[PDB]
Amino acid sequence: DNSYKMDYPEMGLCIIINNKNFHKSTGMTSRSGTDVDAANLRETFRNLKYEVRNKNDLTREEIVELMRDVSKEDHSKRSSFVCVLLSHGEEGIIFGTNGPVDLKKITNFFRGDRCRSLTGKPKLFIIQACRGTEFDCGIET
Amino acid sequence: HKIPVEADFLYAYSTAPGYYSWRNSKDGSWFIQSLCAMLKQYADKLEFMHILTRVNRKVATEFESFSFDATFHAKKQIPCIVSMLTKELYFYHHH
């Protein structure tokens, strides 16, 4: 009882949101190199037997819609759920191509009480995005 | 008879709260590069938190920003593992 049950018929879904191009208003420049990340992730999770679904340049409205729809699927035969977000961001925020979305709004769809077929199963959110504008200058070792 | 609605979530942040996160235009983000590398090398054995800890060390030790703009040069990064998980997670199963 110390390890999650990972022998369901399917390991589960691996949703990858790859946002590279943003609207001028956001002032965010093209995220050069993100496609490399998306491809790397795709292969990595494919090897772990996850059902990978890649989505490119989604508006904040589309991110919410995608998350809602995915949370409404029947995950009964899935051992876990993985969501990877690649975009610009701020503390507690991820960017759609046209603006900010609160990470909480995204993760709430999968709460133990809002996605019953995932209750008791690991829900992983991997977030490659900024969480502010502070630099870590490090320390010599 | 019940579990918290926030239980069983794992948020693997690429960087610490309040900080920038780095991405190389040619090689991809430091965090994703390292995550995929550690998963490929240790997913058949190590528990997830331990894999993520190695990701933390990889990003922390093998990466430092290089920029013609002194303002963005010689910077470092440490990921941030946030776990509300209640059990150990292995990406394999013992038949």
Binding site: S87 | S21, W22, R23, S25, F66
Partner: peptide, 4 residues
């Protein structure tokens, strides 16, 4: 190297 660029920032997110």
């Amino acid at each position: 190297d660029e920032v997110x």
